[PDB]
Each structure stands twice: as structure tokens, then as C-alpha cells.
Amino acid sequence: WMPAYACQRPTPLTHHNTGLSEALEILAEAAGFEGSEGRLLTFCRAASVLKALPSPVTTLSQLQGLPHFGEHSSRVVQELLEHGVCEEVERVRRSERYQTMKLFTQIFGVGVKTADRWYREGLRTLDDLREQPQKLTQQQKAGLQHHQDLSTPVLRSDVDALQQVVEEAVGQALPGATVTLTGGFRRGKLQGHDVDFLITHPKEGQEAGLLPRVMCRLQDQGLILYHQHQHAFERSFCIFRLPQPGSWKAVRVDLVVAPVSQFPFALLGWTGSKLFQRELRRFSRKEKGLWLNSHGLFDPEQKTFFQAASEEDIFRHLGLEYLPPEQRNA
């Protein structure tokens, strides 16, 4: 009754199974920390099925017929229904390995391989990292400097203020250039870990050199704490200093520039969710023989690229019913 791929079904922002999906996602995350990519994807998929259900799962009977609910994920839900707690999940939560890997990987500029390296070298705390500055990139140093603020959920109100200053800077640098909110906030999330913006201009090539001008403008207003510009799309992964009444908050902001020919692919890729996009790309390759990414949709047999004006165009070309961003919360 429910389709196998996350991109074939709506997944709304709010759902009836948050306890169960959260528990499965702890196990997915822990698997990724150990390099167990298959196990990660398996738990992620099961959690996403629960998100798409129209009712709470009260009894294990309601598991019947559902895709991606193998033995292990079923046992986890069974323990939660019967005992209110799953021993395996609680052991993961209490473990020093999991707690440390979560601590490190949530730092700006730190991935799983870096976090694991540090773990294996005997580092455990944020102070441990500050004691070894030669082990840190400039990005990671900035992440540590602002870690309290960067751990604080970003709110819709923060997003609105940030979009205003980014739009002002973009508009003053280049009349006609546009700013589009992407990421989780485009999917309707009330809170997030950063804010993602996609910048373009309707005339191909007019976007050249725009981002550095935008950054200069923001820097001169005192709004930038950290900036790493990289000429993949031109992008700037930043920490903004967001003014607030009587104080200020550091906030992570990703700015991406795409040429307008690629904008639909970029918007689709950058809107997520991460699992939704993984599933959409797996679907495109496996079911339709096409390779999808943030730049385009390629037929490797014909050596052709699909011309899309909208996300809707891309869904249609892949034979999928269109899902608006708020239904991509897989």
C-alpha cells in the first residue's frame, strides 16, 4: 500500500511516530559513525516509512505489508511498544564513542573521518580540541569559537532576518539577481542547524563575480564572522553575526551561486531532505537509467542533458508525481 522509494510518496513535516523514528535514526547515525553505510541507509529508510504513515503505530500488527522493515528495525519498534525503551538504543546513547562522535561531527567543518581520527587519538572534549590547535583547520577553529551559538537551533525568525540582509546585499550588487531560500526551511521546518540560500540571475553569466561582491557588502556591515569562498558551484560557507535585541547570535549560512540553466537541478538538490535526494537519485538511475545530480539530468547511453525550467519538469521527466518541498521530509 505504500511505495518503496521515498520519492514516490509524500512525507510531511509532522507525523505520528516521532518516538519510533527518532530511535531508528539514533541507530542509523551510530552506524554511520562506524563507517557502516548499508546499516545507516537501512535504518534511515525504516524511519522514513514511519514518517509517511497516517496513524501512530500502537501495536506490531501495523508493521504488516510495509517496505524496508526488516527484522532488526522491527525488533527495535517491538521493544519500544512493549517495554517503552529499547536496550540497544539506550546503550548507544550512553556510549562514549557515540557521544564523542556526535560532539565532534556537529562542529562546523568536521566530518565522520576527522571525528573518528580524533577519537582514535584520544581526544574527547571540546577543550581537548582547543588544546591542540595545530590539529584544526581555520573552519574548525571558527566552529569551536562559536560552538554554543551554532548548537542553538536556528529559528524561522532568524531565517527571515538573514534572508533580508542577503537579499539587500544581492540587490545592491546586481539588480535583477535573485535569492531563494532552500534546505530544510524551504521544506517547512520551524528550526534548523543552518540557513541555505541559492543565488542566480535570469541572464546566463550575469552571476559571474556576484558572490564576492555580496560578501564584501555583508562584511562591511559587520555581519560576517567567518567566510570560506570556494570557486561544483561557487559557494561561501559562512558564519553570520545575527543581531538580536540586546545581544547577537552566530548562525551558519551557506550561499550557493548557480547559473540559471542549472537552477532547477540546484534548487532540487539543495532542498533535500538528504534521504529524499538519495532516493530520488537511486530511483533515477535504477528505474529510469538517468544520472541525476545538482547540475543536471544525464542520459549516459545517449550522452544528453535534460533541459528543465522547473523542479516540476524534472519530476515529470522521471515519471514521478510532483512533490512540493514540504512533502520531501523523508
Ligand SMILES: Nc1ncnc2c1ncn2[C@@H]1O[C@H](COP(=O)(O)OP(=O)(O)OP(=O)(O)O)[C@@H](O)[C@H]1O
Ligand atoms: N554545506 C553544504 N555542503 C554540501 N551540501 C549542502 C550543504 N548545505 C546544504 N546542502 C545540500 O542541501 C540539502 C540540505 O542540506 P543541509 O545539510 O543544510 O540540511 P537541511 O535539510 O537544510 O536541514 P538542516 O540544515 O536544518 O539540518 C542537502 O540535500 C544537501 O545536498
Ligand SMILES: [Mn+2]
Ligand atoms: Mn540546511
Ligand SMILES: [Mn+2]
Ligand atoms: Mn547547509
